[PDB]
Amino acid sequence: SLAHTAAEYMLSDLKGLRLELPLDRIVKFVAVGSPLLLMSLAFAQEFSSGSPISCFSPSNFSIRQAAYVDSSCWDSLLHHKQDQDKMKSLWPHKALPYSLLALALLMYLPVLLWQYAAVPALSSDLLFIISELDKSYNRSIRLVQHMLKIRQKSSDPYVFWNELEKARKERYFEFPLLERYLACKQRSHSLVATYLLRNSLLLIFTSATYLYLGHFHLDVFFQEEFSCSIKTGLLSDETHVPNLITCRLTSLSIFQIVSLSSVAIYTILVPVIIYNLTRLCRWDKRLLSVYEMLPAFDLLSRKMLGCPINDLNVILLFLRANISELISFSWLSVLCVLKDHNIDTVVDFMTLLAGLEP
Amino acid sequence: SLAHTAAEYMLSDLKGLRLELPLDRIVKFVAVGSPLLLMSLAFAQEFSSGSPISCFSPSNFSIRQAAYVDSSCWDSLLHHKQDQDKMKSLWPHKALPYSLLALALLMYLPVLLWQYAAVPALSSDLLFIISELDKSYNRSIRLVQHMLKIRQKSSDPYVFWNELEKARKERYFEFPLLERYLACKQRSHSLVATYLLRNSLLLIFTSATYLYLGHFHLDVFFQEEFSCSIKTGLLSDETHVPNLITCRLTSLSIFQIVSLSSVAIYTILVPVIIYNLTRLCRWDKRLLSVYEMLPAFDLLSRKMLGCPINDLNVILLFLRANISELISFSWLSVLCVLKDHNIDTVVDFMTLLAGLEP
Amino acid sequence: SLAHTAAEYMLSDLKGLRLELPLDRIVKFVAVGSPLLLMSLAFAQEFSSGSPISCFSPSNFSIRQAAYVDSSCWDSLLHHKQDQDKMKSLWPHKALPYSLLALALLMYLPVLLWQYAAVPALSSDLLFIISELDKSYNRSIRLVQHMLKIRQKSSDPYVFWNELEKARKERYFEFPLLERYLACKQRSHSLVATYLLRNSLLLIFTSATYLYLGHFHLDVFFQEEFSCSIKTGLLSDETHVPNLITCRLTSLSIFQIVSLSSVAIYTILVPVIIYNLTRLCRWDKRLLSVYEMLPAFDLLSRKMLGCPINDLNVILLFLRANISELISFSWLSVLCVLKDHNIDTVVDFMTLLAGLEP
Amino acid sequence: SLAHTAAEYMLSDLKGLRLELPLDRIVKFVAVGSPLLLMSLAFAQEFSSGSPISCFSPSNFSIRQAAYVDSSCWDSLLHHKQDQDKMKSLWPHKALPYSLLALALLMYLPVLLWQYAAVPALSSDLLFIISELDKSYNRSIRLVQHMLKIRQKSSDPYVFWNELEKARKERYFEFPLLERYLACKQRSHSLVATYLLRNSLLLIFTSATYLYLGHFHLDVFFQEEFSCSIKTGLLSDETHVPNLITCRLTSLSIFQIVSLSSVAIYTILVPVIIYNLTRLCRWDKRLLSVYEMLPAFDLLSRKMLGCPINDLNVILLFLRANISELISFSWLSVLCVLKDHNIDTVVDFMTLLAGLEP
Amino acid sequence: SLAHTAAEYMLSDLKGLRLELPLDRIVKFVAVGSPLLLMSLAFAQEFSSGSPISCFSPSNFSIRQAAYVDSSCWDSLLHHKQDQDKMKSLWPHKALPYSLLALALLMYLPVLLWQYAAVPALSSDLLFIISELDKSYNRSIRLVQHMLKIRQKSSDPYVFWNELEKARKERYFEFPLLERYLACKQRSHSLVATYLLRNSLLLIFTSATYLYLGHFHLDVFFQEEFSCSIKTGLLSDETHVPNLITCRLTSLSIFQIVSLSSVAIYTILVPVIIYNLTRLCRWDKRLLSVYEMLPAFDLLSRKMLGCPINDLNVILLFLRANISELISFSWLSVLCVLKDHNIDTVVDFMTLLAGLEP
């Protein structure tokens, strides 16, 4: 089955960045692999359908004539009701695998749009961001060996403030270019549209699937017997039954169960994308108390105003997922005992020098 | 069969930390792989079922007519009893693989929840804790070694009872950051909730499986013959049998054996999760006797009081399984001969000094 | 099926250079793999063909005679209409896989032409050009150190208003090799033809596919029943039906869907080739403002005049995709804060020393 | 067949330690894979059974009726003997694959028990021993090499019986850390119970297999023809033979051969388990003569007294297998010429210094 | 087929030592893989047997009745000859696969026992012997170069006939540990018993195969038609043929060919085993003429006395296959010139100083 090779080629799980949120990956997995899995279950493995149509041909017919009768109606699914002659078609029974494959291909479009429209740019931005944090951290490394015999011998305030205010105007406190980079990036409105459009495509496709299931299905759902005709052409001048009644659709149960599963999976999937969309509608101030004290992280906390829709929200959402890899997976994360005005200041710095890393 | 592929993808066996207990692993393996194995056995390998329904059609029927007979009843499981006209359905026979796959997928949810909502924080805490405790070694053999050298130069109270306080309560012998970190953790109640929910989901899934097996199964269990009807539609105006009796279900034995095995496996597996849950309801004091001597290992034994339902219990339980990789898989493990007040204290030192460590 | 294999060898995704645009890549993917996917869907997997034609032979015929009748009309697919005796053929039904394979093979010609007659000559140019232009960061505030420091040494115009005509404009700063190379490349008109030919081949082949679908298809489209003759040879002297009416094509629906999808995919693909060919018809000056300040990058924006159909256009088109490999993954992409006269050009400068890499 | 996959997954052949004896390994292999091999041979490959039952239906019956007759008795194996109506079941014929799979999975429990309840503790207790034994090597030859500085030019009585006699009491040569450890492990009894349970499980399991083969088999062994009944339900009101006599079991020979092989393999396997049980019941004093002279091995050759049940026996048993890895695969193994009171003590030493390794 | 799987698992082709003689390897290959190859050839691939028995049922019988007749005699092979009622059985036709697999498994036991009972000690001895023998190179050139250098400074008896006793019988030109090791080992008789038993097991298995082929085969060899009985049970009260004559065995020729090949292969194999056995019954003295001149190799050449059945014989037998790895793959192998007492001793020593090892 092509479902397996589809699952292998597409839907398959720089050098270090996490470019996709776990919830987005879960949503993509569930929305893309479900049609392929349903197609694999329906037309392979357990339920060997064989022939999807059976016909009650008269006993006078031979084997090949019965095969002709049952094969000339599968491609001509038409109910010749006696109620004029409203020939109702049951084409979903034949087009179900095509619809499943079309939905599987369609649900992959937002993934490609995200991956190609804006991923080199985001990679460039965050790569540059991480390319100078390491060098500034190295520039901040050469303070502990300065704070070992100059800091120790003192009457507490002076050196543990005195050398700090000496280091305050000293050029390893004010960061080189971030003060302008963040101003450039926050105001630019280019990358939020990609996120919004990616979520809107999934919502629109779910709505389209609902419309498809509500309009074409739900009508031929409890219909299992239909009467066809063979003498509708060159065979009209022949002596046999003019209405080959009681042609039964063998795989009706598979049809119903596939429809129900397709409805249910997207029904439970709907609110997750809405939550992801609403994630960007607010300014996240969970850990902002500890951010305003650190030199570099003060700038991230400062530019938190105005409309909550700009590139800064997405960049911060991606950095928070990338703030714990190997180097910021440190004191910053360990600074959880500082979440509970002259004592708090000296308590906060003692904790900082307690984790003196080397 | 897709059971093999499902076993390949899901249920397939930082950088050194153990993020799962062996009992939890065996529980997950047994609860996940069992439905897949049952599905593989039931509809593949040994017993090639062929057609799960056989029909005793009258000899006047043709081959294609008999095929239509036996295909028009496998999707219309209905016992047309003469007792009015209660058509009892036998749909579990058709839906057994569906139920098995659904159970296998449902039982994978707690593993995903544990992986997504608790693994990173617990890994971070374990990393910080191990990085702090590995430095506790060169603080009781390298810092305390000047108790044996001074003991032989003096006698009793001012050499062994009056120096254990000015050295134990010394700056190099304190870990205040670790004490504060565990003090803030013992108040937390987030990560224990993940464990409780992970076990509770398995409990409710086992209960739901019990209701499913007790309500739908156990009724169609000893019934192997049912009389169907064909003239319930456009075939009503025809001359043949109106009640085509004795349609026999071929794979009843597989059904019964699968149901019995599913009952037995989970009946055996039930108390294990209960024991896992009650593991957290007590404070474990199996080795505190040797722990309270060490500098850093005194703290984790000190903050051991009050209600046991908290984060520190979980982190310590995971730490016990994580205390023996390559570094603490040493003297700490060898500290078994000191498990049996001023006699052994001078003799427990000589065993400790006997090891020249590197 | 051969479609899977052809997808494995053909269409499978120096040492760092990107010689193909992503739009070109996706165009090639969706132009080459689409007929292979259609062929795989049409004659394998979900829809099991069996026999592509059914015959209504008289009941007197045996099984082997009916098989002969069925097999003697597929290779002689021929409508003997009574309307003299215009013997219309329905050969597209038989020739669809051959046509699909021919189109799939024909789609590869522009790709191989570009890979053979364009890649090495252009790759030499890219390697050489990136090689000179790398020598621009050594001609930075390392060599322009006495320009920011001369602000207080010297005064006003001959600092950062007229200092550039003698101190900057001198032999060390300028590059004669670029001046010699770019003019000759501008006058050259060799490689400007390969891109146009490769796009025009795809356009011509699309038009040919349209003509094929409009002439041979769209006529035998709703025809599913035709009458044949078997007494057109050595069987003429036999007593049986002289014309065997109602030979039904079982796979008419697959034919219709294949034709419709083939039309739709190429209709969607048509404008992208036009966009790609028109990409070269204009000069891109999006980031020319920041290019003319830099020493080496000034020459790229200086030779920007005349007719756009030149080698330089393709060179810069491929360079902008490779301007972010690992070393130019830096300040030039960083300099977004410079896209908003005395304060303007100075602010151009301390932004350069902020990203001083080491 | 699932037997192949079961063989790959289970029963598939620190970092250098040998935690398993070869005899126990071969016992596990021949006890686990044997039922899997029998299952693979019995229901696949050479003997393509097809249908396990053949029925002599009357010639009036059609093909479908005969198929129903032969399929309605395989799942209802019940001998309707005329001797009241003691309908006897021949259910082992249908349950043989289930029994084989149950035994194959069932034999694997002791392996898991040994791997989970004894591997870590034994690995640690043996690793400490080998680590001490490879860290206390230099004090066996080079220790007396400095005493050999005088030995070359000093009289034997006072440089072989008195000068290095004090070196025996010296600080450098003594291993109390073993001396207490051996006794402490000797007083324990935790790990011997795991070995005893592992072997007793195999013994009980073989006896259970014997009970199964003696009670339910050995009765339907020469029976190949049984007479069934079809009119035992809704078909009672029909005109045909009341008993479909002479239903012959096709695969009786496979049944008999499988039973005989299962009996013979375990009959051959029985004494090895007993020998492994009694291996622990005695002191192994094969090489105690050379152990009592060596520094570290004197302690190993000191403590063998009292009851034979202790963890020390298992530890030394596993150490003997690992005493020839790469470093103890040395002079100790070379010391085979010292297995044949003033000349014995001197010949034993010039042999020791003859193999002075570097 | 299991033949391929067995070939992959069993019979599949320290760290440098060669512990199996090429002749032993080819003997094992041609003795183990031959039955597997015969089984793979005969019961698969080219000769698709299908049904191994054909029945000439009367034309009145139906298809299912004929299938019953032909399936109830394959498992009941009994010739109801009219000559009382000597029902001769033809069970080898059914048991040939089982016999072939049993022979294939039986021929592997000596390999396993040799692997498990002789490899460790032999490898230890070989490693010891090589690690001592490789030191002999700097023991005849680095130590005896002052034999021809002094020779030119004097004349005859005190320069080439009186110094050969002072220099040869010196401390550094002696190997006491090695000579004692060989003295101890030539008394041993453990490893030689393994070789003798390994060869005798193949001999007895060959004789058993001959007995099996001569007792059960060679009787049913030209018999292809046997008359069975079907009214030997519940069918006795029926109206049909009491003697269903002419049940023809389809696979007689392949049976004959398999038997002939099995006889011929082992007939060819027999003398190789006896030659391998007789290899140990003599002292090999081919290159021993020069072995008496090297210092260390003199001990290997000295102890050729008494009965040749010793562990020493086997240790040199495995040594000669291992004298040409990389280091003794040298001057020793170069020494072909000196295969054609003062004259020869003085002329021959001109090579090592000329052919320097430095």
Q: How far apart are CA C184 and CA B260, in angstroms?
A: 85
Could you tell me which residues come within 8 angstroms of residue C44 by beta carbon, excluding any fewer than 6 positions away? C1
Give yes or no for D111 touching E (CB within 8 A): no
| C-beta atoms of B177 and A333 within 8 A | no
Give yes or no for C135 touching A (CB within 8 A): no
Give yes or no for D62 touching E (CB within 8 A): no
Please name every residue paired with C249 in a beta bridge, in sequence order, or none if there are none.
Answer: C53
Give yes or no for A234 touching C (CB within 8 A): yes
Output the CA torsion D69→D73→D75→D77 (10° steps).
180
A155's tokens: 């009457």
The single-letter code of the amino acid at C130 is I
Q: How far apart are CA A99 and CA A101, in angstroms?
A: 6
Instruction: Give the number of other CB atoms < 10 A from CB of residue B131.
Output: 9
Backbone angles phi, psi at B28, to 5 degrees: -60, -45
Q: Solved by what technique?
A: cryo-EM
Check: CB of residue B229 under 8 Å from CB of residue B242: yes
Residues from chain A that touch C40, judged by Cβ atoms under 8 A, are: 2
- What end-to-end distance do the CA atoms of chain E give, in Å? 59
E293's tokens: 């001149």
Give yes or no for B59 touching A (CB within 8 A): no
DSSP secondary structure string for all residues of D71-116: HTTTTT-EE--------EE-THHHHHHHHHHHHHHHTTHHHHHHHH
| C-beta atoms of D248 and E68 within 8 A | yes
Q: How far apart are CA C133 and CA C175, in angstroms?
A: 10
Interface test with D, best of B12, B13, B30, B56 (most D CBs within 10 A): B56
| Angle at which helices C119-133 and C311-322 cross, to 10° | 70
| C-beta atoms of D184 and B333 within 8 A | no
Check: CB of residue B244 under 8 Å from CB of residue B71: no
D5's tokens: 């996959």
Closest residue in chain B to residue A65, using alpha carbons only: B64
| C-beta atoms of B235 and A56 within 8 A | yes
| C-beta atoms of C333 and A5 within 8 A | no
Closest Cα in chain C, distance from residue A124 (Å): 7
Give yes or no for E175 touching D (CB within 8 A): no
Check: CB of residue B113 under 8 Å from CB of residue B201: yes
| C-beta atoms of A63 and C59 within 8 A | no
Could you tell me which residues come within 8 angstroms of residue C90 by beta carbon, excluding any fewer than 6 positions away? C77, C78, C79, C220, C223, C226, C249
Sign of CA dihedral A305, A311, A317, A319: negative
Please name every residue paired with D53 in a beta bridge, in sequence order, or none if there are none.
Answer: D249
Closest Cα in chain B, distance from residue A7 (Å): 12
3-class state of residue C355 by DSSP = coil
Please give the C-alpha separations between residue A124 and each of A120, A130, C328, C339, in angstroms, as whole numbers. 6, 10, 10, 18
Interface test with E, best of D4, D46, D243 (most E CBs within 10 A): D46
D59's tokens: 């010639």
Backbone angles phi, psi at B101, to 5 degrees: -65, -40
Residues from chain A that touch C225, judged by Cβ atoms under 8 A, are: 233-235
Give yes or no for B76 touching A (CB within 8 A): yes
Q: How far apart are CA E297 and CA E133, in angstroms?
A: 8
- What end-to-end distance do the CA atoms of chain A give, in Å? 57
Is residue D66 packed enough to be buried (19+ CB in 10 Å), middle (13-18) or exposed (0-12)?
A: buried
Interface test with A, best of B64, B75, B311 (most A CBs within 10 A): B64
Closest residue in chain D to residue E117, using alpha carbons only: D22
Backbone angles phi, psi at E108, to 5 degrees: -90, -20
Q: Do chains D and A touch (3 or more CB pairs under 8 A)?
A: no
* Nearest Cα to Cα of residue E274 among E217, E210, E206: E206
Interface test with B, best of D49, D55, D65, D175 (most B CBs within 10 A): D65
| C-beta atoms of C334 and A235 within 8 A | no
Check: CB of residue E119 under 8 Å from CB of residue E110: no
- The three-point CA angle E104-E110-E112 to 5° equals 90
Number of A to B CB contacts under 8 A, please give it: 74
Check: CB of residue E297 under 8 Å from CB of residue E175: no
Sign of CA dihedral B205, B208, B213, B216: negative
Strands, sheet with C53-55, edge to edge from the N-terminal-most edge strand: C53-55, C244-249, C225-228
Secondary element (H or E) of residue E105: helix E92-106
Closest Cα in chain A, distance from residue B272 (Å): 30
Q: How far apart are CA A117 and CA A95, in angstroms?
A: 33
| C-beta atoms of C40 and A235 within 8 A | no
Check: CB of residue C201 under 8 Å from CB of residue C109: yes
Number of A to C CB contacts under 8 A, please give it: 95
* Nearest Cα to Cα of residue B312 among B301, B322, B323, B321: B301
Closest Cα in chain D, distance from residue B186 (Å): 30
Q: How far apart are CA A54 and CA A71, in angstroms?
A: 9
Which ranges in chain A belong to alpha helices (H)?
A: 2-9, 22-42, 63-71, 92-106, 109-117, 120-141, 157-160, 162-169, 178-187, 192-215, 252-278, 288-291, 295-302, 311-321, 331-334, 343-354
Place of tokens 């960049």: A315
Give yes or no for C22 touching A (CB within 8 A): yes
Interface test with A, best of C18, C45, C327 (most A CBs within 10 A): C45
Q: How far apart are CA C53 and CA C39, in angstroms?
A: 19
Instruction: Give the number of other CB atoms < 10 A from CB of residue D214.
Output: 11
Check: CB of residue C296 under 8 Å from CB of residue C176: no
| C-beta atoms of A354 and B94 within 8 A | no
Q: How far apart are CA E152 and CA D41, in angstroms?
A: 81
Backbone angles phi, psi at C226, to 5 degrees: -140, 150
Instruction: Tell how strand B225-226 and strand C88-89 pair up.
Output: unpaired
B238's tokens: 């025809």
Nearest to D56 among E5, E183, E235 (CB): E235
Check: CB of residue A89 under 8 Å from CB of residue A77: yes
| C-beta atoms of D176 and B40 within 8 A | no
Place of tokens 């935790």: D190
b (16+ CB within 10 A) / e for D156-169: eeebbeebbeeeee
Secondary element (H or E) of residue E225: strand E225-226
Check: CB of residue C313 under 8 Å from CB of residue C125: no
Check: CB of residue E231 under 8 Å from CB of residue E238: yes
3-class state of residue E88 by DSSP = strand
Please name every residue paired with E89 in a beta bridge, in sequence order, or none if there are none.
Answer: E78
Please name every residue paired with B79 in a beta bridge, in sequence order, or none if there are none.
Answer: B88
* Strands annotated E in chain D: 53-55, 78-79, 88-89, 225-226, 247-249
Residues from chain B that touch A338, judged by Cβ atoms under 8 A, are: none
Nearest to C333 among A63, A67, A124 (CB): A124
Q: How far apart are CA C115 and CA C24, in angstroms?
A: 13
What 3 state SS string does E5-71 have? HHHHHCCCCCCCCCCCCHHHHHHHHHHHHHHHHHHHHHCCCCCCCCCCEEECCCCCCCHHHHHHHHH
Give yes or no for A262 touching B (CB within 8 A): no
* Nearest Cα to Cα of residue D117 among D16, D19, D7: D19
Q: Do chains B and C touch (3 or more CB pairs under 8 A)?
A: no
Nearest to D234 among B45, B245, B350 (CB): B245
Please give the C-alpha separations between residue B153 and each of B158, D170, D301, in angstroms, as whole numbers. 11, 22, 38
Closest residue in chain B to residue A67, using alpha carbons only: B64
Backbone angles phi, psi at B78, to 5 degrees: -150, 125
Place of tokens 């963040």: A182
| C-beta atoms of D224 and E176 within 8 A | no
* Nearest Cα to Cα of residue B245 among A223, D238, D212, D131: D238
Give yes or no for A49 touching B (CB within 8 A): no
Give yes or no for B306 touching A (CB within 8 A): no
The single-letter code of the amino acid at E32 is V
Give yes or no for E181 touching D (CB within 8 A): yes
Q: Do chains E and C touch (3 or more CB pairs under 8 A)?
A: no
Give yes or no for D229 touching E (CB within 8 A): no
* Nearest Cα to Cα of residue E79 among E69, E71, E87: E87
Q: How far apart are CA D295 and CA D175, in angstroms?
A: 8
Q: What is the DSSP letter of C89?
A: E
